[PDB]
Design a protein around this ligand. Structure first.
Ligand code: MG
Length: 565
């Protein structure tokens, strides 16, 4: 794959946002997705950056730095003459299952530690394409990024400090979580764990935290060495092919399923995998899959477990936000408690603003905020990036806050089921229809809008109302966002949503989301007394509706979807 002249134009571009003259006080952090590139392309970043006029650069050891640690280092990290970096370049694409022929993508995070605002990122579009001349000027330095220490240079008081890529991130997690209580959980006699980093930059962190930090044996953590995959494995958490973690616990790549693994004494009670760049995660139990949304909710209900939210004489937890496409199981947790909810659009910006209210830009002073998306990861205000490894420690703290010394402990399945038993369960599943004609794709979008708009009380089920094409107005900056999903809400809380995902000319993919509430067949009785219906069968109703409504089968020629969550 190729693109405009080199890639440095991007680095030059972000500097064409920062207007001159900084002089020599600008410090930035470098590091990115494990592999494959970085090393040979890190050099490029430094030469250009130094040719632009930054004083100092903190590169991560080996050029590796997980996104959440990136934000961490730019946020809370002051030492060596005492300096704070005002920006950072992250070398990750995240949504790239491979990288043959040196495929590449790059990210930028701003002074608040989080990703660059929409204003900045869109202005870089111009420079990346319109660049008529670049400035690098080989003189020619080529630092060693694999050895700790600082390298001071001439012609411009420049300096590259290769920093340990793990100490600060592991230190932060030790502060926000009661690691001592987590130790009691994993250093017990009836709790087997299983972490997989898919040879992702999260790898080293897993070792440094789960082994050196908690004390879990190394034989539980898997694929914790960074590598440039050529014949596996995909760094995208899902049910399919990446059914490795899925299989270990004893599942099929068809949701909660079951074959010949029912009674095996070798099934871990907790398995988790991490995204390529540790920004997103997937958490599993002994034969139990936790929907990313159900996960968000459980963490919200039992947030009194981590000191981060408890200490600082806080209110306990006053905040909670989620992408609209995400299931509303976290809404019901915001009901049984008093913390104010947000249903924002897709994109992190909104999370940034909601977080950025305590220490910047008015609004609600307190900000102990939690965040999450359907396409997993989730996070909080502790950093300004979604964090995978953080969540896994969260889920440990929750299970820890159960006290099982001696007596047997409740498994994750119960905990979620208990949580299902307390607030009721929000079924969630997503139907993808890939490679359809944009004609038919939009036709389905208009049909579900238009035909439902002027007939709100049409169709089946209960009173299906509040149907709209989701628009949202940012409460902190005042941005207005539209056409971010044709909603079709029901009375009880159920809904089915269509969202159109299609970048450029290559067809499109109808993103049909399914959500059906139920508080029946429970609660408090351990496992509805063997009447486990299960989320997949009861969604058949909502499916029958949706297709009939959207005329989806009639407009596209698709009986069955491409993907199912
Ligand atoms: Mg990612």
């Amino acid at each position: 794959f190729q693109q405009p002249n080199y890639t440095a134009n991007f680095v030059q571009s972000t500097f064409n946002a920062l207007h001159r003259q900084g002089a020599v006080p600008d410090v930035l952090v470098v590091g990115g997705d494990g592999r494959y590139y970085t090393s040979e392309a890190v050099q490029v970043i430094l030469k250009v950056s130094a040719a632009n006029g930054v004083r100092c650069v903190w590169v991560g050891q080996h050029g590796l730095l997980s996104t959440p640690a990136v934000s961490t280092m730019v946020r809370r990290r002051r030492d060596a003459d005492g300096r704070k970096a005002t920006g950072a370049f992250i070398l990750t694409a995240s949504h790239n299952p491979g990288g043959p022929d040196a495929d590449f993508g790059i990210k930028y995070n701003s002074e608040n530690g989080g990703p660059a605002p929409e204003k900045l990122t869109s202005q870089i579009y111009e420079e990346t394409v319109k660049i008529t001349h670049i400035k690098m000027a080989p003189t020619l330095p080529e630092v060693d990024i694999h050895t700790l220490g600082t390298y001071t240079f001439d012609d411009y008081n420049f300096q590259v400090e290769v920093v340990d890529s793990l100490a600060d991130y592991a230190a932060y997690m030790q502060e926000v979580f009661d690691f001592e209580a987590i130790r009691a959980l994993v250093q017990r006699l009836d709790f087997k764990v299983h972490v997989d980093s898919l040879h992702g930059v999260s790898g080293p962190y897993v070792d440094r935290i789960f082994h050196e930090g908690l004390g879990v044996p190394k034989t539980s953590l898997f694929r914790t060495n960074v590598l440039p995959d050529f014949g596996g494995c995909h760094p995208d958490p899902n049910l399919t092919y990446a059914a490795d973690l899925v299989h270990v616990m004893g599942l099929l790549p068809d949701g909660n399923a079951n074959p010949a693994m029912k009674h095996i004494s070798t099934v871990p009670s907790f398995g988790v995998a991490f995204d390529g760049d540790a920004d997103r995660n997937m958490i599993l139990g002994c034969r139990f899959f936790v929907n990313p949304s159900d996960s968000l909710a459980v963490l919200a209900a039992n947030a009194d477990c981590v000191p981060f939210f408890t200490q600082s004489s806080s209110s306990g937890l006053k905040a909670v936000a989620r992408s609209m496409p995400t299931s509303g199981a976290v809404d019901r947790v915001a009901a049984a408690h008093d913390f104010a909810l947000f249903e924002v659009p897709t994109g992190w910006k909104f999370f940034g603003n909601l977080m950025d209210s305590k220490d910047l830009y008015g609004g609600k002073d307190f900000n102990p905020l939690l965040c999450g998306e359907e396409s997993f990861g989730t996070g909080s205000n502790h950093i300004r990036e979604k964090d995978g490894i953080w969540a896994s420690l969260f889920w440990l703290s929750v299970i820890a806050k159960r006290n099982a010394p001696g007596t047997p402990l409740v498994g994750v399945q119960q905990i979620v089921e208990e949580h299902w038993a307390t607030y009721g369960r929000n079924y969630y599943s997503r139907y993808d229809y890939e490679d359809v004609s944009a004609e038919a794709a939009k036709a389905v979008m208009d049909t579900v809008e238009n035909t439902v708009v002027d007939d709100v009380p049409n169709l089946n089920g209960v009173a299906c109302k509040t149907i709209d094409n989701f628009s949202y107005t940012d409460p902190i900056d005042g941005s207005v966002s539209t056409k971010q999903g044709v909603r079709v809400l029901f009375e009880d809380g159920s809904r089915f949503v269509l969202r159109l995902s299609g970048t450029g000319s290559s067809g499109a993919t109808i993103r049909l989301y399914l959500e059906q509430y139920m508080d029946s067949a429970t609660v408090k009785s351990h496992l509805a007394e063997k009447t486990l219906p299960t989320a997949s069968t009861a969604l058949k109703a909502l499916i029958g509706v949706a297709l009939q409504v959207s005329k989806m089968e009639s407009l596209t020629g698709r009986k069955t979807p491409t993907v199912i969550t």
